[PDB]
Amino acid sequence: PNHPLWYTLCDRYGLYVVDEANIETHGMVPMNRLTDDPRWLPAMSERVTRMVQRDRNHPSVIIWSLGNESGHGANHDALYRWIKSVDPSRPVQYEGGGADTTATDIICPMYARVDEDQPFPAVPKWSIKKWLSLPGETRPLILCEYAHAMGNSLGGFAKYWQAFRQYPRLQGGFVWDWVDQSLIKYDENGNPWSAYGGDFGDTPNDAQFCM
Amino acid sequence: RRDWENPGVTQLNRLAAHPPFASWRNSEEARTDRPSQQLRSLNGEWRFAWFPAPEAVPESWLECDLPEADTVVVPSNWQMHGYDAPIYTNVTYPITVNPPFVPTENPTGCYSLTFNVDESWLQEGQTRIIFDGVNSAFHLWCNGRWVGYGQDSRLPSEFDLSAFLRAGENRLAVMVLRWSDGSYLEDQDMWRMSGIFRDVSLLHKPTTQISDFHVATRFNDDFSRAVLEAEVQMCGELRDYLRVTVSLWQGETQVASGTAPFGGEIIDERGGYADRVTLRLNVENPKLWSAEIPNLYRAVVELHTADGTLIEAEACDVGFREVRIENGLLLLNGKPLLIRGVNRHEHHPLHGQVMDEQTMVQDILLMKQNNFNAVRCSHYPNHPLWYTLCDRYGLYVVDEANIETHGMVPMNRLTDDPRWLPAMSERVTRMVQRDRNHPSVIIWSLGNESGHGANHDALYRWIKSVDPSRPVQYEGGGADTTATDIICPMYARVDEDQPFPAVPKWSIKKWLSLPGETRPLILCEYAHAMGNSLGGFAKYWQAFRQYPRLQGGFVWDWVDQSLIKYDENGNPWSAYGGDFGDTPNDAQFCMNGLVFADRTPHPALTEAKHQQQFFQFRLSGQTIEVTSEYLFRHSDNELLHWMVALDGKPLASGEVPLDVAPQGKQLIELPELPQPESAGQLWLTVRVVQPNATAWSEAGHISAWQQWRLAENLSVTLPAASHAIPHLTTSEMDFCIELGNKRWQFNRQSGFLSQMWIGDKKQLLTPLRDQFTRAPLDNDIGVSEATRIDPNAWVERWKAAGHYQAEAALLQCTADTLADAVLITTAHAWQHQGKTLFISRKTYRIDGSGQMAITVDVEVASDTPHPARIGLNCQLAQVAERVNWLGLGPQENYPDRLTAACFDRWDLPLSDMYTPYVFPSENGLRCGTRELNYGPHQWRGDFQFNISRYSQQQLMETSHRHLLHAEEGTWLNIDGFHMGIGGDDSWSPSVSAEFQLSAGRYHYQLVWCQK
Amino acid sequence: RRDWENPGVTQLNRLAAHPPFASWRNSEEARTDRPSQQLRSLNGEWRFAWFPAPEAVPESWLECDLPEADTVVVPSNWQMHGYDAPIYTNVTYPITVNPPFVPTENPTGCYSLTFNVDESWLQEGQTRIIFDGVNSAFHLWCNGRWVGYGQDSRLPSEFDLSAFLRAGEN
């Protein structure tokens, strides 16, 4: 959940917002170890319910998100239903566990390619055109993350947009991401320079992967 | 920190819930389910001290035993020991509604125990203590050191004591609080007690252990093949040498087995569960489990090293069955179920809410003997043994979460509050985690009467997610919300709608077809058996059998929640609300069972057994069509016994072997019956007898029966000629008729028969008078809260109309001497405040044979509430030992509750003609009676009657059966007509129109003579 | 009670969540969305002291300012002021994965602020304190008395201070 003023600005300047609960357990093994554990349901539910209770009147918020990279747990299904019950005005999405589980109204993969499949075991990232028509599937597809803009990047960006425009159910996505997470540091001469992972003695760290 | 006033803290240091563990260290023992040395019981004599509040408990108690304490038995409810009073309140909370706060004066029970621990348990593995039930919250200490905290009174709380124990003597200190924020979720309609009411045990597990395991059974289209999947979870040192072996047994024969190392399949980008493994075993033509035939297999889960070293083994009984809802029908192994269920609380008249095996077994045997096949755990998870028993004897179970917030306003104030979601989820999730392997459990319930909140939807989905093998139901908020797979209303009537705002209770037939509705309907509660009740019960079962989607319901309920008290002479008597100084209270509304607290049946139990029969019959000429409502079993322990009798006189009889396939039919043509000599009605009575004893019944057990009127030959022969002629003697005050040794006396002032003489003795203590009222039944009083007096209740309407105060006004009284008899004509009018309620016109014809023909014709004002009865009553001077009659019996039966009774010649001791309802009311009636015999007297005609030593007046003025005193002589009530008793619920008029005496004009005739 | 190592305790005495409030006492001010005198900002210069673990925090800190504390701007992340190093890791947790436990060495930031309220606030009404964001958990004290606890670094944590306030400096 963002600083309260962000939603007011989006309401006024006009930007569609996906409000996401502060829940990410990426480092767990497997990713859903905690989210599928009934003992963590209470902590998770407050992160979802208190978000909804705070931002439910903002017109800019058009979609609720259960969080990020926490696999797919029964806690997600429970909280998904909680929202649908409390606020039927907004669709609920969540990418964890395969991007098309029972906890999301929208097929929302991260980095699924336009034409090329990535048949990872359990959590495959199908070509987005193919994903749409898998037997039984009918939901819309909007990538929660795509076109990773790390450094000299965004190659193949036009391929996505040609697809978004030709396929009615391919409704876009959110580029990753807006601003480099670099921090300022000063050399002996007092001159500032852009720093990243490990430049503060922090270790282990993931170097430039924060930009 | 006052954790007992924080819905955010429902436990501290409590271990995760799981299925029943015994930690066997020998596979064979696990297979045979014999005792486990690793599982000890700490039940027995403990120390106990009561305190008005926790702040009163002295610090010394934590380290040393309190001198003031007493030695009591555990498990037990401390109210049953007299430390404080048990409180019976229905809806209104026993404490002020100010969540999450509880009264500062909070009864606190300090339990303590000194016990031994073998050094062997502390040298390796983990030693935990398990409290199966503590009401309602508690703190634990071991040897002076604080261990943990827990809430929810109906599920086990476990704690690791490995680092607190010492070899030899140890001391536990448990401070149990009566009230806690947990109480807000425990407002069930029952006695509010407290203490350590369930088993306390010590379990020892290896460091590398089985921490959890789930068993599932999937089938192919025709159930000719199955796959048993067992997911096993472990804790501790994870190594490549570890393995899990799940073997399935049928008796001593291993039918299947699978072995595998840990490391589940990949589930997400981070991999899978390295601490889990799933074994899949193929089973061909498995023996399916059902309440009809509870086939069970034994599954043994072995944790071991690849090379053969057993670390530990766990196990459970596996019932191969599939529960699914398809096309609107609840199916068991592919067949539509017809739920013959009942709600059952855990109650004992002496021990309170503490359950024991014998009581559980008795209940199950009684339930199955009375054709019940299902039970609902109203309204909390039960004692662990209950499920094992239901698995083995065969009963479908609805496992219900310990959540009820009935007293809140509105009912969903807390269930719709996300801040209460945590406390609620634990009551649901821990239940499922504990009972998911029991085959007997076929449906999960989210709780009872807590309205409908978002929390319910969240938890509904949580269960659908973790356990897709069982349907989920919940009645709150309308009985058909998004939180239930089954339309499960309570007290919805068969044909009549009750359009309550927001939460209407539609007629069940109409409910099924509401636009868009497709779900099956099974009432979670119906046919309230409070006192003299269950009228209209047959109407439900006729509908259940005609409507596919009406699949039954659970009667409310199994046993009266009465407690035993003692008088000055030390004699026991049944007590209810308010009998312990408890107030506010809801008096007798805690007694709604088909059986008494001591399990003695109420008359209504036979009505239930009859309507719930598994065999249906139809007659056509000499042929009896038998249909089986069994879904799986054949009638391989049933024989049909038939009997034809003429007005109680046996003419013919015989038996035929029953051989009908489930859902099948069998035709049985009866022999060429011999045309009877005497005049009268021939009656055919058939009954299904179980030749062989079973695990739930004795040899000869009768499971079903049905009666039919056969040929009837009306008597056209006139009785012999009378020798003498009755003589009339007149005085201003009376008309006295004499014929031999017999004398009749009619008071000319009252207009009633005031006396009769048979030989040299008088026969009446009170004159024979009209009666239009009855001691009000609980259904007539119609209240569920001792504070609400519904003016619409039958008793209130009769009282306001003056039925109980109307006095008889004589309009006519004349005598006439005929050729061979004397005729007495009378007319009375009952009035109240210038309003004529009833008019009774009679004639008494006493002829030369010594018989008195009484013809009665009554008019009832159309605008006065329909009368409870239309008959006569009097107090006979004598008391006989037996009561003999030709009519419906042998047990008590009323107009809307008499399908179970059979027409025949019955003979019972006087005492059996009185039903001992704890709260006294009209009782013991028997209908369709053509002849009644008592002492020298005989009454003939077509009436209903009850006979006892208690007058309607005494019954009406007495609150407890033990306060009744036999009156002199015998009170007789003979009715031409009697109102139905109803019972669809006991807090509103529930007697169907067809059983209301609204005809305006009534006629009945009786012949009184000597036998 | 080490509430920061128990997922069963995500807060203590925290008020219920709700949409943005200002408690306008004038309808036109609310319509125009102008400022509300009933809503005060406490952003500015606070007193801060860093500690390697909560056990290192001196009980004296609850009663009066710590001499070794510095004056810093709030809101802010103490890493940006140089009290300790910000850490950049993608997937792998920055602490040993052993739920619900965290390191015994747990950087602790002790913030404090002396203030006072309008006389009428001491008279009637409910006065609450709102922390729009605290990373990652915290205990709150007012005039030396414990008020509450709260988690979740990205949503506001509110507490009723009504029964703690007093005339003069708080």
Ligand SMILES: O=C1O[C@H](CO)[C@H](O)[C@H](O)[C@H]1O
């Ligand atoms: O609706 C109900 O009716 C019964 C009345 O005896 C009893 O109170 C049950 O617990 C409740 O669910």
Ligand SMILES: [Mg+2]
């Ligand atoms: Mg609590």
Ligand SMILES: [Mg+2]
């Ligand atoms: Mg209730």
Ligand SMILES: [Mg+2]
């Ligand atoms: Mg915590």
Ligand code: NA
């Ligand atoms: Na598109």
Ligand code: NA
């Ligand atoms: Na990154």
Ligand code: NA
């Ligand atoms: Na049916």
Ligand code: NA
């Ligand atoms: Na009741």
Ligand code: NA
């Ligand atoms: Na048979």
Ligand code: NA
């Ligand atoms: Na009475």
